Design an enzyme around this catalytic site. Structure first.
Site, PDB file in Angstrom:
ATOM      1  CB  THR A   1      -1.340   6.697  -2.516  1.00 53.55           C
ATOM      2  OG1 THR A   1      -1.349   5.272  -2.389  1.00 53.55           O
ATOM      3  CG2 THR A   1      -2.537   7.265  -1.783  1.00 53.55           C
ATOM      4  CB  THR A   2       1.651   3.495  -5.354  1.00 53.67           C
ATOM      5  OG1 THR A   2       1.707   3.038  -3.996  1.00 53.67           O
ATOM      6  CG2 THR A   2       2.901   3.049  -6.081  1.00 53.67           C
TER       7      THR A   2
ATOM      8  CG  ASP B   1      -2.119   0.892   1.029  1.00 53.52           C
ATOM      9  OD1 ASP B   1      -3.071   0.457   0.350  1.00 53.52           O
ATOM     10  OD2 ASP B   1      -2.111   2.019   1.560  1.00 53.52           O
TER      11      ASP B   1
ATOM     12  CG  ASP C   1     -10.698  -2.887   0.073  1.00 54.84           C
ATOM     13  OD1 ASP C   1     -10.590  -2.028   0.975  1.00 54.84           O
ATOM     14  OD2 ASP C   1      -9.884  -3.818  -0.086  1.00 54.84           O
TER      15      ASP C   1
END
Ligand SMILES: Nc1ncnc2c1ncn2[C@@H]1O[C@H](COP(=O)(O)OP(=O)(O)O)[C@@H](O)[C@H]1O
Ligand SMILES: Nc1ncnc2c1ncn2[C@@H]1O[C@H](COP(=O)(O)OP(=O)(O)O)[C@@H](O)[C@H]1O
Lengths: 497, 472, 497, 472
Positions: C75-76, C42, C363
């Site tokens: 995010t990544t 994550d 999720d």
């Protein structure tokens, strides 16, 4: 340890020729220490001319040189393989398996493979060219060898292939194996400058001359030929008979019973007319090197003087014809006495295309010779290696002890040829091999690698990728011998000359 | 064997860097230093590559390649090959097999040659303004001391003589052009002569319908032998006698009662022009080996005697006298004039010309980018890289003029979106892009094609070779 | 130079999260300096908890944290992209292009891409669940998010998806963009231990109790509910009326007008019988934490004493039912007063499957929320990036100067996502990209990369690979901001606190 | 980030090397050295991994994994994971992405578990010979001083008590087994007791129907308080009183007129067996928290007093006294007995057993090689590698016995071509392959499965992690 050094020596040598494999074989640049250079992807040239360093490597060179000596085609294939065997051996040494065991394993594997080669070989039909079966085979193998090296147009190529075929018709045959022994001494390639490649032509000899006099006979069915050296105190003087002399000379030539006269020094118009009256085929002057070649085949003798001439000096040929060759009339001689070699008139528009065509014909001839000597073809592109590997694993299963691992290690080496051979085509060295294994174990043994197209082929025979058995077995042999000889050497010892 | 390849690429890049700044019509000069201490200052790239201290095999090879088939164009080939090598390196880091890069470059080469063949403007020997422009093109940046529009005249006049049409193409036998030089005044004193020129009271001077003896070749006995040798020549009816080996002054007296030159490169063209032939041994000398020269003579260069063979039989005869101050001047003049002769000769013999300033280049790149997506994946990148490598030439050309490379590249690229600006290139003095055809920046298509061809060949050779081996 | 160091710092940071991208994102192991550890792929967790070293990298971390703050999913993807931009910038710096130029170029490219995002976006239909159009979309996106993280059987999964859908029906909507604002505060997930996942069920509240007395009413159409705290000097003593008391209590409860009685302390048989006579639904004792939650929704009040009770304390619900749930009877309450959140009874046979199901639902809900907020979907698997790159090159062509190269360099960065994203699937980082380009420029914009299956897909919508626009635009934004801010910094200066 | 991965693999390989030679029924012993200078000589792998000086995070992790769900089997898991890691490394050098290797290994794991599930021989609590064999299996190589067939008896007798069948499966509450030890004589003096055992003239001894007080918990004022505390306990009717904290001897006098133990691990099982419960504060003490023990008492160990709680209410109660000479003996006895109890317990609770000697292993490999070609390319290699990694265990097992690994591997491989030799394994003392089932080399299938499972999990974890980061 010294063994490992030797192994590393041979291995490191083999690493270099890894890239020079197959069609896309990368180049190697040889620096002739004299201050000169020559570059090539040829195993023989490289291995020969290169000045090798390490003894083991020198021994591998020796093996390769032997491999070349026995047959020309496969040389690098042996070295890469040897390297693979040693590389797979050094992994078994780490398994703490004594070299001799590995050696025996490799011997057995070699024998089994050697046994399996014919089992997996597709025998061909060589029963005449009347049928065209041979032609299709010869066409496939022609294209096999030709495709890699030609950038020329196919239509031009087809003619060259036609010529090679026409050549092979005439060449000799050994009976025992139902194969054909192509004596390359029975092929001439005369490089004529000027003209297109398609104008090239095959025939059992020709002098490249035009009919001296159009009235002169341009075609003779049943021919009789003569070779003339001289053009038509105790004092000796010529009798005052100028034209009568010439006429009598021509009459003597006609009296001997000749239909063709190829004068060394050339013929004058009067002699031409007389010859034309007698209906003799006159030919202009030719080189000494040419006439000397002619007389021995033609069974004739260079007459120094016609007054002393005799039918003993009279030659003969089945047919002679003034033929058109690219808008260039030429005298063709067919089937005379000792036919020996078939003569190609090679019409090159440029020295490059000329030498290129010659080269092509040469390679094609050599390859076709190699396959013809042993009339069994193998699926190239690395297919047969994979097949053998499968069979050798299957065979390895039924052997026990540490030798089961030695044979299996022989199989893992063979599979380096498909791996490397594909890698040259820029394909992934790994996925290609597993894809092959999948296609192979679950399909035809003909699954292989088309390096030219750079793709894996389900059946390489369909892509005209063919390999002779005579080469393969020898490669296998010399490779095994090499890797063996390397593994068998314990260590080095200082000696005295 | 990447380790062996990278060294090759480095060698090529080194030679590129060697010849880089010499490029263009504002190309700086390089100072060559002999180990003796003597030096040679020059712009011409061939000369550099000749006198240059070559290190690497691939280097000497590359030089051997760039000089093969026309003196100029070598510059272009070298630098182009360098760019291609660098971009190839960039492609190699992306783990692309050389045999792919090669293929891509080959395709790119084909498209490039198609492009040049397509763009090319057909020209003839009559369009003398073109010939002048092409001459003047290479002459720029030579640091020749003026008379460019006069030297160009001499060139245009020179090539005109050496030209005869058997069929479709005039056979410009360039090898009939003699070139000598002397000091004094300036290059305005340079001048042509129809016949060949070569730099005791002796034999007579003005020989009309002259037969020319061309010959490359105890004491009392030797005297007898030498006199025999002279008499042998005398017995063939030779008006003027030429030699290469040293002649005994006794033989000069003899012959005077009946020069030794220095170079055979002159005797060659003398044999070419006069129609006679050279003999190795005078024992074989005849009367037919003597060359015909309708009005041979000698004249004084301001500081020296000089030999003139005027009225030579052959129509295609010509020579030029070069004049100037320092050695660098006359030398650069010589080399420049050679370049000019080459370019113009190729224009005549080929019959096509294009615009310089990198127009053809950005056109080729423009084409390649369009053709690139039409082929496979990895090849497309190679082709694109090829295009970039070509643009590199425009960039370097901009650099050598003291301009910002990228800006001008982008400008030209933007301009060449129009079909009607296919000639637009870079005006280095002005600094701005302009139609290079009107400015007389014209070059032979054949030169460009050959440069591309040779560069491609060189780089592919560099990429094809995996390792270097010592043989015997 | 200092700029290049910063660039290297941010770049080197981005290099690490390069592998943690997409489904097959490799793990990163975080060592909590307290002597503890936590591992994950994550972006948020990593970037957050990790103690970063270099300032530039810290700034990139800051950007990422902002990126996470605005929205959770991507995010990544932002960090990798930023790294790509800087890496492509440092190549232009070598072209001697001043940073500010690159910055402006990147700004323009960003604006154009941002403009192009909706142009290349496929808007969806959110007009009710009556139609099932929304369901198909929700199913696709469900499977999009679920597929990567589930090893469970599809049949079990389908039920979970059914639940999430049933949840979304009830959740609120903002009008302006024709989208839906899923307030996650409107969802409960009660983790019940024991039972299969398929036994799980959705309803607007339930107490997980059985009917106290079978005679007692197990179903009430129109309900009225009461919450009871107490089970049924100046001296005070109870009057001697034992059963009459109970009966009167029940009669009082019946008098108030209640149909359901959920006692806090539990009910005795006598009270059960009386309630059964009056036809009231009795429920066993419940936890304080449970009843406290109930009363506020139910609009009722925990009665301390029934003698003092009043209909003010009377609650109400639309429906109550003793329903079977995996052979476990439970009292369900439906649509009462302030419905607030929809309650899931999650029947986990094990804590793992329990937390797994909860996680999955969470999720799925978050993703569906993100797509629902902005009702336009984008072709995932890197397709939209490639499309943008094509469009941005096309757009770059019409810009001149050094900025044409800055925009083109923005495009080359986007294409690193397809490259990296495929590479995670073990595919060749190069050939995949060119294959994509080929399929893309000559085909649909939906051509992308299926990482799960590890293959290039001609249309990723068909493989249910979908990405919200709300996330993408933000990723693009924060990435651009980051790379910009890095490029804009000239050098470092020593300061005083 | 290969650099971070290789270190992990190296760590795993290091721990493998640490536990490698301990493996098998001829496993050598390791000497653990505390920084104090004190030492611990042992064969048991868990103990090693416990007392071992762990260095790497991945290491401590691996240990944490191998010990998760049964003391033994850890050995197998560790070594297996090591082999898998090494083969994974071998696969990695071939440029294969970890996510492929992981998938392959997972498939291999599935097939392996299928294989074990398939081969497994169902057993019951009645087949005591099996229980004995399984007990004796782990007991071999423990260096325990004899009485293996007696300790095994004690085990078989022990597990029998702690077992009650609610439904299909007996609930073997292993945690009810107390384990203590003392010196003197040999392990033939080892002995069971139905009740729990724990190592002033005081309160009375033989309490029949005993209520047991289980309790973990100016001077004159303190005396009053303490006496209050004692009286509080006295007022609940507690026959025998147990504590953990230190008790003032005054309270001992008091109580005597009405032990402090040392460990709560005993008080735990006491609470388990007696049916009573522990209290944190005696203020909350009642009469129901008192445990029922039908015939409590005390006895003398040859050198020490010892407490016995015989006649405990709960049926599932049991304790064992261990005896011997040196510490290493009694310790190895303890750990060995724990291993035995574990294995047997798992056999009972699971109800399946397989043959040791690496039969299951070569079977699994045999299966994997067959299943391998049925899947994709790169995964096939991973699966094959998995099989080899499994065979590594047989090889190491051969190594630890002073035999040639490869030969015996090949032998077993050859033997396992027959369906009827699926039990054949390696007789280490004999040196030759033999049917391991008849020789009583039997182990619980669940142990093997768990070992495989945990090893797979560990290695996949090692491969999934790309880099290591410091957080806060
Ligand atoms: N007047 C000019 N304006 C712009 N470019 C020119 C001009 N003259 C030559 N060039 C460029 O210079 C290049 C050739 O330069 P170079 O080889 O160094 O000199 P030369 O032409 O004398 O060999 C060509 O690519 C051409 O485009
Ligand atoms: N008598 C035996 N003969 C052959 N192999 C055995 C025997 N006893 C145990 N093994 C082997 O030893 C391995 C377990 O060894 P290890 O874990 O070191 O000891 P323990 O079983 O006490 O934990 C198993 O794989 C099993 O096959």
């Amino acid at each position: 340890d010294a063994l490992r050094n030797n192994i590393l020596a041979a291995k490191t040598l083999a690493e270099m020729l890894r890239s020079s494999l197959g069609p896309k074989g990368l180049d190697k640049m040889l620096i002739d220490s004299f201050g000169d250079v020559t570059i090539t992807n040829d195993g023989a040239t490289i291995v020969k001319d290169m000045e090798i360093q390490h003894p083991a490597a020198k021994l591998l060179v020796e093996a390769a040189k032997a491999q070349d000596a026995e047959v020309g085609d496969g040389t690098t294939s042996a070295v890469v393989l040897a390297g693979a065997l040693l590389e797979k051996a050094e992994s078994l040494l780490d398994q703490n398996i004594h070299p001799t065991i590995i050696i025996e394993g490799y011997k057995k594997a070699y024998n089994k493979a050697l046994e399996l080669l014919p089992q997996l070989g597709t025998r061909i039909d060589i029963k005449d060219l009347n049928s065209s079966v041979a032609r299709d085979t010869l066409r496939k193998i022609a294209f096999t060898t030709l495709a890699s090296k030609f950038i020329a147009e196919g239509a031009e190529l087809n003619k060259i292939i036609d010529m090679v075929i026409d050549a092979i018709v005439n060449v000799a045959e050994p009976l025992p194996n139902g194969g054909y022994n192509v004596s390359l001494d029975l092929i001439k390639i005369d490089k004529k400058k000027g003209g297109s490649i398609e104008d090239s032509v095959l025939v059992k000899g020709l002098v490249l001359d035009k009919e001296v006099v159009h009235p002169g006979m341009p075609r003779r069915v049943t021919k009789a030929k003569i070779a003339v050296l001289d053009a038509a105190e105790q004092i000796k003087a010529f009798l005052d008979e100028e034209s009568k002399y010439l006429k009598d000379m021509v009459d003597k030539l006609a009296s001997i019973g000749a239909n063709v006269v190829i004068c060394q020094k050339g013929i004058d118009d009067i002699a031409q007319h007389f010859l034309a009256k007698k209906g003799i085929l006159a030919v202009r002057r030719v080189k000494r090197s040419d006439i000397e070649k002619l007389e021995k085949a033609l069974g004739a003798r260079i007459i120094s003087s016609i007054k002393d001439a005799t039918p003993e000096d009279l030659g003969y040929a089945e047919l002679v014809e003034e033929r058109r060759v690219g808008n260039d009339k030429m005298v063709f001689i067919e089937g005379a006495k000792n036919l020996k070699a078939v003569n190609i008139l090679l019409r090159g528009s440029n020295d490059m295309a000329l030498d290129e065509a010659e080269r092509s014909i040469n390679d094609a001839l050599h390859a076709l010779r190699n396959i013809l000597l042993e009339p069994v073809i193998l699926p190239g592109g690395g297919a047969i290696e994979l097949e053998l590997a499968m069979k050798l694993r299957e065979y390895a299963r039924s052997v026990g002890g540490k030798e089961q691992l030695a044979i299996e290690a022989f199989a893992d080496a063979l599979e380096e040829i498909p791996l490397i051979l594909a890698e040259t085509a820029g394909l992934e060295a790994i996925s290609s091999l597993m894809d092959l294994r999948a296609r192979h174990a679950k399909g035809l043994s003909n699954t292989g690698v088309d390096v030219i197209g750079g793709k894996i082929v389900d059946d390489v025979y369909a892509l005209n990728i063919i390999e002779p058995i005579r080469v393969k077995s020898q490669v296998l042999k010399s490779a095994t011998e090499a890797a063996t000889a390397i593994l068998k050497i314990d260590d080095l010892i200082a000696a005295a000359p | 064997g990447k380790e062996a390849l990278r060294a090759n690429i480095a060698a090529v890049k080194a030679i590129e860097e060697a010849l880089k700044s010499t490029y263009g019509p504002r190309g700086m000069d390089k100072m060559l230093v002999d180990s003796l201490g003597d030096i040679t200052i020059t712009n011409d790239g061939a000369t550099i590559l000749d006198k240059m201290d070559l290190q690497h095999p691939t280097g000497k090879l590359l030089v051997q390649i760039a000089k093969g088939q026309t003196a100029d164009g070598t510059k272009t080939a070298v630098i182009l090959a360098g760019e291609l090598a660098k971009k190839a390196e960039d492609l190699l880091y992306k783990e692309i097999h050389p045999t792919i890069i090669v293929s891509g470059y080959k395709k790119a080469e084909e498209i490039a040659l198609k492009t040049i063949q397509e763009i090319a403007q057909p020209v003839t020997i009559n369009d003398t303004d073109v010939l002048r422009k092409v001459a003047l093109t290479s002459l720029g940046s030579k640091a020749v001391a003026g008379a460019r529009e006069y030297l160009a005249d001499l060139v245009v006049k020179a090539v005109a003589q050496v030209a005869e049409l058997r069929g479709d193409k005039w056979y410009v036998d360039l090898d009939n052009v003699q070139i000598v030089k002397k000091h004094g005044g300036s290059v305005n004193d340079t001048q042509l002569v129809y016949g060949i020129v070569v730099d005791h009271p002796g034999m007579p001077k003005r020989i009309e319908n002259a037969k020319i003896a061309l010959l490359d070749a105890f004491l009392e006995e030797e005297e007898n032998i030498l006199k025999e040798k002279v008499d042998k020549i005398a017995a063939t009816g030779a008006n003027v006698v030429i030699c290469q080996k040293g002649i005994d002054e006794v033989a000069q007296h003899y012959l005077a009662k009946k020069v030794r030159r220095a170079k055979k490169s002159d005797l060659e063209k003398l044999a070419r022009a006069t129609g006679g032939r050279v003999i190795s041994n005078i024992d074989e000398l005849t009367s037919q080996d003597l060359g015909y020269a309708a009005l041979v003579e000698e004249r004084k260069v301001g500081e020296d005697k000089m030999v003139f063979v005027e009225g030579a039989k052959n129509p295609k005869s010509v020579s030029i006298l070069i004049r100037g101050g320092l050695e660098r001047v006359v030398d650069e003049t010589e080399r420049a004039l050679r370049d000019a002769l080459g370019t113009v000769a190729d224009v005549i013999r080929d019959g096509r010309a294009v615009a310089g300033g990198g127009a053809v280049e950005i056109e080729i790149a423009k084409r390649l980018r369009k053709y690139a997506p039409q082929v496979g994946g990895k090849e497309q990148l190679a082709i694109e890289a090829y295009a970039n490598a070509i643009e590199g030439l425009i960039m370097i050309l901009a650099e050598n003029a003291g301009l910002d490379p990228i800006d001008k590249l982008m400008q030209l690229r933007s301009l060449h979106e129009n079909e009607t600006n296919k000639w637009y290139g870079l005006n280095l003095f002005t600094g701005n892009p302009e139609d290079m055809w009107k400015l007389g920046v014209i070059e032979p298509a054949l030169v460009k094609m050959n440069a591309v061809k040779a560069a491609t060949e060189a780089v592919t050779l560099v990429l094809r070779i995996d390792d270097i081996v010592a043989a015997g």
